[PDB]
Enzyme design. Structure first.
Site, short mmCIF file in Angstrom:
data_model
loop_
_atom_site.label_atom_id
_atom_site.label_comp_id
_atom_site.label_asym_id
_atom_site.label_seq_id
_atom_site.Cartn_x
_atom_site.Cartn_y
_atom_site.Cartn_z
N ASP A 81 0.75 -1.24 0.02
CA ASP A 81 -0.02 0.06 0.06
C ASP A 81 0.84 1.33 0.02
O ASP A 81 0.60 2.28 0.78
CB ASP A 81 -1.17 -0.20 1.18
CG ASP A 81 -2.00 1.04 1.00
OD1 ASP A 81 -2.31 1.63 0.02
OD2 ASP A 81 -2.72 1.46 2.20
N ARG A 103 -0.20 9.18 0.99
CA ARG A 103 -0.82 9.08 2.21
C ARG A 103 -0.28 8.53 3.37
O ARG A 103 -0.67 8.68 4.69
CB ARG A 103 -2.70 8.83 1.91
CG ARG A 103 -2.46 7.29 1.73
CD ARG A 103 -3.94 6.94 1.41
NE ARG A 103 -3.91 5.50 0.96
CZ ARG A 103 -3.71 5.38 -0.63
NH1 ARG A 103 -3.64 6.43 -1.26
NH2 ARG A 103 -3.57 4.23 -1.14
N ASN A 104 0.65 7.46 2.94
CA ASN A 104 1.24 6.37 3.96
C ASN A 104 2.55 6.81 4.39
O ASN A 104 3.04 6.25 5.11
CB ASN A 104 0.99 5.10 3.38
CG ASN A 104 -0.26 4.61 3.65
OD1 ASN A 104 -1.21 5.02 4.45
ND2 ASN A 104 -0.57 3.47 2.69
N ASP A 152 3.45 3.92 7.42
CA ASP A 152 2.30 2.89 7.63
C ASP A 152 2.34 1.85 6.78
O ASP A 152 2.74 2.03 5.57
CB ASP A 152 0.80 3.71 7.40
CG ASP A 152 -0.07 3.51 8.32
OD1 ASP A 152 0.03 3.56 9.83
OD2 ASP A 152 -1.26 3.13 7.81
C1 LIG Z 1 -0.42 9.15 8.29
C2 LIG Z 1 0.61 8.60 7.52
N1 LIG Z 1 1.35 7.45 8.05
C3 LIG Z 1 1.40 7.01 9.33
C4 LIG Z 1 0.41 7.63 10.22
C5 LIG Z 1 0.51 7.26 11.57
N2 LIG Z 1 1.54 7.33 12.50
C6 LIG Z 1 2.11 8.55 12.72
C7 LIG Z 1 3.57 8.73 13.24
C8 LIG Z 1 3.90 9.55 13.71
C9 LIG Z 1 3.08 10.96 13.25
N3 LIG Z 1 3.73 12.19 13.57
C10 LIG Z 1 3.02 13.19 13.02
N4 LIG Z 1 1.63 13.16 12.52
C11 LIG Z 1 1.30 12.01 12.40
N5 LIG Z 1 -0.01 11.93 11.56
C12 LIG Z 1 -0.87 12.80 11.26
C13 LIG Z 1 -0.98 13.97 11.94
C14 LIG Z 1 -2.05 14.92 11.26
C15 LIG Z 1 -2.90 14.43 10.28
N6 LIG Z 1 -3.78 15.35 9.85
C16 LIG Z 1 -5.25 14.72 9.55
C17 LIG Z 1 -5.98 15.36 8.26
O1 LIG Z 1 -5.94 16.86 8.33
C18 LIG Z 1 -4.62 17.25 8.42
C19 LIG Z 1 -3.86 16.83 9.57
C20 LIG Z 1 -2.65 13.30 9.51
C21 LIG Z 1 -1.86 12.31 10.07
C22 LIG Z 1 2.10 10.91 12.63
N7 LIG Z 1 1.44 9.36 12.25
C23 LIG Z 1 -0.45 8.65 9.88
#
Ligand SMILES: c1cncc(CNc2ccc3ncnc(Nc4ccc(N5CCOCC5)cc4)c3n2)c1
Ligand SMILES: [Cl-]
Length: 273
Positions: free
Chosen positions: A137, A141-142, A155
Protein backbone atom coordinates in the site's frame (compact mmCIF):
# COMPACT_ATOMS: atom_id res chain seq x y z
CA UNK A 1 9.74 -8.53 20.60
CA UNK A 2 7.46 -5.42 20.72
CA UNK A 3 8.51 -2.98 23.52
CA UNK A 4 5.71 -2.30 26.08
CA UNK A 5 5.26 1.22 27.56
CA UNK A 6 3.35 1.97 30.82
CA UNK A 7 0.16 4.14 30.31
CA UNK A 8 1.31 6.48 33.18
CA UNK A 9 4.44 7.31 31.09
CA UNK A 10 2.19 8.54 28.16
CA UNK A 11 0.72 12.09 28.63
CA UNK A 12 -1.57 13.05 25.67
CA UNK A 13 -1.18 16.74 24.77
CA UNK A 14 -3.55 17.37 21.83
CA UNK A 15 -4.91 15.73 18.71
CA UNK A 16 -2.74 16.23 15.54
CA UNK A 17 -5.38 14.60 13.33
CA UNK A 18 -7.84 11.67 13.07
CA UNK A 19 -8.16 8.94 10.44
CA UNK A 20 -10.44 5.93 9.85
CA UNK A 21 -9.45 3.15 12.36
CA UNK A 22 -7.80 5.51 14.92
CA UNK A 23 -6.70 8.95 16.20
CA UNK A 24 -3.21 10.61 16.33
CA UNK A 25 -2.13 12.66 19.30
CA UNK A 26 0.95 14.73 20.07
CA UNK A 27 2.17 13.36 23.40
CA UNK A 28 4.98 13.41 25.89
CA UNK A 29 6.56 10.06 26.79
CA UNK A 30 8.55 9.49 30.00
CA UNK A 31 11.35 6.85 30.49
CA UNK A 32 12.01 6.24 26.74
CA UNK A 33 12.90 11.19 30.68
CA UNK A 34 10.65 13.60 28.65
CA UNK A 35 10.21 13.05 24.90
CA UNK A 36 7.87 14.52 22.30
CA UNK A 37 6.09 11.57 20.51
CA UNK A 38 3.09 10.79 18.26
CA UNK A 39 0.58 8.26 19.61
CA UNK A 40 -1.85 6.31 17.46
CA UNK A 41 -4.99 5.20 19.41
CA UNK A 42 -7.02 2.27 17.99
CA UNK A 43 -4.27 -7.64 14.22
CA UNK A 44 -2.56 -4.99 16.38
CA UNK A 45 0.30 -7.31 17.53
CA UNK A 46 1.25 -8.12 13.88
CA UNK A 47 1.44 -4.42 12.77
CA UNK A 48 3.44 -3.60 15.95
CA UNK A 49 5.78 -6.60 15.22
CA UNK A 50 6.42 -5.23 11.67
CA UNK A 51 7.20 -1.70 12.93
CA UNK A 52 9.55 -3.18 15.60
CA UNK A 53 11.38 -5.35 13.01
CA UNK A 54 11.85 -2.49 10.49
CA UNK A 55 14.68 -0.05 11.31
CA UNK A 56 15.84 2.45 8.70
CA UNK A 57 16.36 6.23 8.33
CA UNK A 58 13.39 6.40 5.94
CA UNK A 59 10.94 4.27 8.00
CA UNK A 60 9.16 6.09 10.93
CA UNK A 61 10.84 5.32 14.30
CA UNK A 62 8.60 3.09 16.44
CA UNK A 63 9.02 3.10 20.27
CA UNK A 64 6.41 0.48 21.24
CA UNK A 65 2.81 -0.17 22.38
CA UNK A 66 0.53 0.24 25.43
CA UNK A 67 -1.80 -2.75 25.97
CA UNK A 68 -2.69 -1.64 29.57
CA UNK A 69 -6.48 -1.64 29.04
CA UNK A 70 -8.22 0.50 26.38
CA UNK A 71 -7.63 2.12 23.88
CA UNK A 72 -4.64 0.26 22.37
CA UNK A 73 -1.78 2.73 21.76
CA UNK A 74 1.12 2.81 19.27
CA UNK A 75 4.07 5.14 20.02
CA UNK A 76 6.14 6.73 17.20
CA UNK A 77 8.55 9.59 16.74
CA UNK A 78 6.68 12.86 16.04
CA UNK A 79 6.78 13.94 12.32
CA UNK A 80 6.00 17.70 12.53
CA UNK A 81 4.80 18.35 8.95
CA UNK A 82 2.31 15.39 8.94
CA UNK A 83 1.28 13.12 6.03
CA UNK A 84 3.14 13.60 2.71
CA UNK A 85 -0.07 13.89 0.61
CA UNK A 86 -1.37 16.94 2.59
CA UNK A 87 2.19 18.32 2.69
CA UNK A 88 2.40 18.17 -1.19
CA UNK A 89 -1.09 19.75 -1.68
CA UNK A 90 -0.47 22.59 0.82
CA UNK A 91 2.96 23.35 -0.73
CA UNK A 92 1.78 23.31 -4.38
CA UNK A 93 1.20 26.08 -7.00
CA UNK A 94 -1.68 27.46 -4.81
CA UNK A 95 0.34 27.46 -1.50
CA UNK A 96 0.68 31.29 -1.11
CA UNK A 97 -2.98 32.47 -1.55
CA UNK A 98 -4.16 29.63 0.77
CA UNK A 99 -1.42 29.47 3.48
CA UNK A 100 -1.51 31.19 6.86
CA UNK A 101 0.13 34.46 7.86
CA UNK A 102 2.87 32.77 9.98
CA UNK A 103 3.74 30.17 7.23
CA UNK A 104 7.45 30.37 6.23
CA UNK A 105 8.00 31.10 2.47
CA UNK A 106 4.58 29.96 1.09
CA UNK A 107 4.81 28.79 -2.50
CA UNK A 108 5.33 25.60 -4.50
CA UNK A 109 8.05 23.12 -3.65
CA UNK A 110 10.83 23.49 -6.23
CA UNK A 111 12.26 20.68 -8.43
CA UNK A 112 15.11 20.10 -5.96
CA UNK A 113 12.72 19.55 -3.01
CA UNK A 114 10.39 17.24 -5.11
CA UNK A 115 13.45 15.07 -6.11
CA UNK A 116 14.66 14.94 -2.46
CA UNK A 117 11.15 13.83 -1.37
CA UNK A 118 11.12 11.16 -4.17
CA UNK A 119 14.63 9.95 -3.36
CA UNK A 120 13.84 9.46 0.38
CA UNK A 121 10.66 7.37 -0.28
CA UNK A 122 12.77 5.27 -2.80
CA UNK A 123 15.52 4.82 -0.10
CA UNK A 124 12.87 3.38 2.25
CA UNK A 125 11.59 1.08 -0.53
CA UNK A 126 15.22 -0.07 -1.29
CA UNK A 127 15.46 -1.13 2.40
CA UNK A 128 12.12 -3.03 2.28
CA UNK A 129 13.06 -4.91 -1.00
CA UNK A 130 16.43 -5.95 0.57
CA UNK A 131 14.46 -7.73 3.35
CA UNK A 132 12.12 -9.29 0.69
CA UNK A 133 9.33 -7.30 2.36
CA UNK A 134 6.32 -6.26 0.21
CA UNK A 135 4.53 -3.08 1.43
CA UNK A 136 1.29 -3.52 -0.70
CA UNK A 137 0.00 0.00 0.00
CA UNK A 138 2.69 2.50 -0.95
CA UNK A 139 1.17 5.98 -1.49
CA UNK A 140 2.04 9.55 -0.25
CA UNK A 141 -0.92 9.30 2.27
CA UNK A 142 1.16 6.50 4.01
CA UNK A 143 4.33 8.64 4.21
CA UNK A 144 5.25 11.30 6.83
CA UNK A 145 7.23 14.57 6.65
CA UNK A 146 9.39 15.80 9.54
CA UNK A 147 11.22 19.14 10.01
CA UNK A 148 13.90 19.85 7.37
CA UNK A 149 12.06 17.93 4.59
CA UNK A 150 12.81 14.51 6.21
CA UNK A 151 10.50 11.95 4.50
CA UNK A 152 9.70 8.49 5.86
CA UNK A 153 7.30 5.60 5.17
CA UNK A 154 5.06 5.64 8.22
CA UNK A 155 2.34 3.01 7.74
CA UNK A 156 2.05 -0.68 6.61
CA UNK A 157 -5.16 2.60 7.21
CA UNK A 158 -6.55 6.02 6.12
CA UNK A 159 -7.38 8.01 2.91
CA UNK A 160 -7.73 11.60 1.53
CA UNK A 161 -10.75 10.91 -0.71
CA UNK A 162 -12.89 7.85 0.09
CA UNK A 163 -12.24 6.79 -3.58
CA UNK A 164 -8.54 5.85 -2.75
CA UNK A 165 -9.77 2.36 -1.88
CA UNK A 166 -12.05 0.01 -3.77
CA UNK A 167 -14.20 -2.70 -2.10
CA UNK A 168 -13.45 -5.90 -4.09
CA UNK A 169 -11.07 -6.30 1.67
CA UNK A 170 -10.19 -2.74 0.44
CA UNK A 171 -7.77 -2.38 -2.46
CA UNK A 172 -5.78 0.79 -3.42
CA UNK A 173 -6.47 -0.04 -7.15
CA UNK A 174 -5.16 3.41 -8.46
CA UNK A 175 -1.66 2.48 -7.09
CA UNK A 176 -1.75 -1.11 -8.29
CA UNK A 177 -0.42 -2.86 -11.45
CA UNK A 178 -2.72 -5.17 -13.54
CA UNK A 179 -1.52 -8.48 -11.91
CA UNK A 180 -2.39 -7.13 -8.37
CA UNK A 181 -5.86 -5.84 -9.40
CA UNK A 182 -6.70 -9.02 -11.32
CA UNK A 183 -5.13 -11.79 -9.17
CA UNK A 184 -3.98 -10.11 -5.90
CA UNK A 185 -0.40 -10.91 -6.87
CA UNK A 186 1.68 -8.65 -4.54
CA UNK A 187 5.47 -8.60 -4.93
CA UNK A 188 8.45 -6.19 -4.77
CA UNK A 189 7.54 -5.57 -8.57
CA UNK A 190 3.97 -4.49 -7.70
CA UNK A 191 5.61 -2.13 -5.07
CA UNK A 192 7.94 -0.62 -7.73
CA UNK A 193 4.79 0.08 -9.85
CA UNK A 194 3.19 1.84 -6.79
CA UNK A 195 6.46 3.81 -6.42
CA UNK A 196 6.02 5.05 -10.04
CA UNK A 197 2.48 6.16 -9.02
CA UNK A 198 3.99 7.91 -5.85
CA UNK A 199 6.37 9.80 -8.23
CA UNK A 200 3.25 10.92 -10.17
CA UNK A 201 1.63 12.05 -6.86
CA UNK A 202 4.81 14.00 -5.92
CA UNK A 203 5.10 15.79 -9.30
CA UNK A 204 1.30 16.68 -9.45
CA UNK A 205 1.60 18.10 -5.83
CA UNK A 206 -0.53 15.30 -4.38
CA UNK A 207 -3.29 14.80 -6.98
CA UNK A 208 -5.18 11.50 -6.84
CA UNK A 209 -4.09 9.18 -9.71
CA UNK A 210 -6.95 8.81 -12.28
CA UNK A 211 -8.93 11.52 -10.35
CA UNK A 212 -11.24 11.99 -13.40
CA UNK A 213 -12.30 8.31 -13.04
CA UNK A 214 -14.33 6.14 -10.67
CA UNK A 215 -12.55 3.05 -9.29
CA UNK A 216 -14.32 0.68 -11.80
CA UNK A 217 -13.26 2.92 -14.77
CA UNK A 218 -9.69 3.09 -13.27
CA UNK A 219 -9.59 -0.78 -13.03
CA UNK A 220 -10.57 -0.92 -16.77
CA UNK A 221 -8.02 1.75 -17.81
CA UNK A 222 -5.17 0.15 -15.77
CA UNK A 223 -5.79 -3.47 -16.95
CA UNK A 224 -6.11 -2.18 -20.60
CA UNK A 225 -2.61 -0.61 -20.26
CA UNK A 226 -3.46 3.11 -20.02
CA UNK A 227 -0.67 5.27 -18.66
CA UNK A 228 -0.99 8.30 -16.33
CA UNK A 229 -0.11 11.54 -18.26
CA UNK A 230 3.12 13.42 -17.60
CA UNK A 231 2.51 16.06 -14.88
CA UNK A 232 3.12 19.73 -15.90
CA UNK A 233 5.91 20.03 -13.22
CA UNK A 234 7.48 16.66 -14.13
CA UNK A 235 10.79 16.88 -16.18
CA UNK A 236 10.92 14.30 -19.09
CA UNK A 237 13.72 12.37 -17.32
CA UNK A 238 11.48 11.86 -14.22
CA UNK A 239 8.55 10.67 -16.44
CA UNK A 240 10.98 8.15 -18.08
CA UNK A 241 11.67 6.78 -14.51
CA UNK A 242 7.84 6.49 -13.96
CA UNK A 243 7.52 4.56 -17.29
CA UNK A 244 10.35 2.25 -16.14
CA UNK A 245 8.26 1.38 -13.00
CA UNK A 246 5.17 0.84 -15.20
CA UNK A 247 6.36 -1.92 -17.58
CA UNK A 248 3.43 -4.34 -18.10
CA UNK A 249 5.47 -7.47 -17.22
CA UNK A 250 6.58 -7.41 -13.53
CA UNK A 251 10.10 -8.81 -14.39
CA UNK A 252 10.66 -5.97 -16.99
CA UNK A 253 10.12 -3.18 -14.39
CA UNK A 254 13.24 -1.28 -13.17
CA UNK A 255 14.56 -2.37 -9.75
CA UNK A 256 13.94 0.06 -6.81
CA UNK A 257 17.78 0.22 -6.36
CA UNK A 258 18.22 1.61 -9.93
CA UNK A 259 15.18 3.93 -9.54
CA UNK A 260 16.72 5.29 -6.26
CA UNK A 261 20.21 5.66 -7.89
CA UNK A 262 18.68 7.61 -10.81
CA UNK A 263 16.61 9.90 -8.46
CA UNK A 264 19.79 10.53 -6.36
CA UNK A 265 21.81 11.39 -9.56
CA UNK A 266 19.10 13.88 -10.72
CA UNK A 267 18.85 15.39 -7.19
CA UNK A 268 22.71 15.81 -7.06
CA UNK A 269 22.80 17.43 -10.55
CA UNK A 270 20.13 19.99 -9.44
CA UNK A 271 21.54 20.86 -5.89
CA UNK A 272 23.51 23.91 -7.03
CA UNK A 273 20.81 25.12 -9.48
C1 LIG B 1 -0.37 9.03 8.48
C2 LIG B 1 0.55 8.45 7.64
N1 LIG B 1 1.39 7.48 8.03
C3 LIG B 1 1.32 7.08 9.31
C4 LIG B 1 0.43 7.60 10.24
C5 LIG B 1 0.43 7.12 11.67
N2 LIG B 1 1.71 7.27 12.34
C6 LIG B 1 2.24 8.48 12.67
C7 LIG B 1 3.50 8.57 13.30
C8 LIG B 1 3.98 9.82 13.59
C9 LIG B 1 3.22 10.96 13.28
N3 LIG B 1 3.69 12.21 13.60
C10 LIG B 1 2.88 13.22 13.27
N4 LIG B 1 1.70 13.18 12.65
C11 LIG B 1 1.23 11.97 12.32
N5 LIG B 1 0.11 11.85 11.55
C12 LIG B 1 -0.91 12.74 11.18
C13 LIG B 1 -1.11 13.99 11.75
C14 LIG B 1 -2.09 14.84 11.26
C15 LIG B 1 -2.89 14.46 10.19
N6 LIG B 1 -3.94 15.27 9.75
C16 LIG B 1 -5.30 14.74 9.60
C17 LIG B 1 -5.91 15.30 8.34
O1 LIG B 1 -5.87 16.73 8.32
C18 LIG B 1 -4.52 17.20 8.40
C19 LIG B 1 -3.84 16.72 9.67
C20 LIG B 1 -2.66 13.21 9.60
C21 LIG B 1 -1.69 12.36 10.10
C22 LIG B 1 1.97 10.78 12.65
N7 LIG B 1 1.50 9.54 12.36
C23 LIG B 1 -0.43 8.60 9.80
CL1 LIG C 1 10.54 7.98 -21.77
Amino acid sequence: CVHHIKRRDIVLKWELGEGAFGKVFLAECHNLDKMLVAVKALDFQREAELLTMLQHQHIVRFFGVCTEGRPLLMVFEYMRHGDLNRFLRSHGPDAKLLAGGEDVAPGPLGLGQLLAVASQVAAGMVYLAGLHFVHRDLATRNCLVGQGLVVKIGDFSRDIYSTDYYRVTMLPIRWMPPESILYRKFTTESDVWSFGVVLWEIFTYGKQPWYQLSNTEAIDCITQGRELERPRACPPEVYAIMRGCWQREPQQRHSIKDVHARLQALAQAHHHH
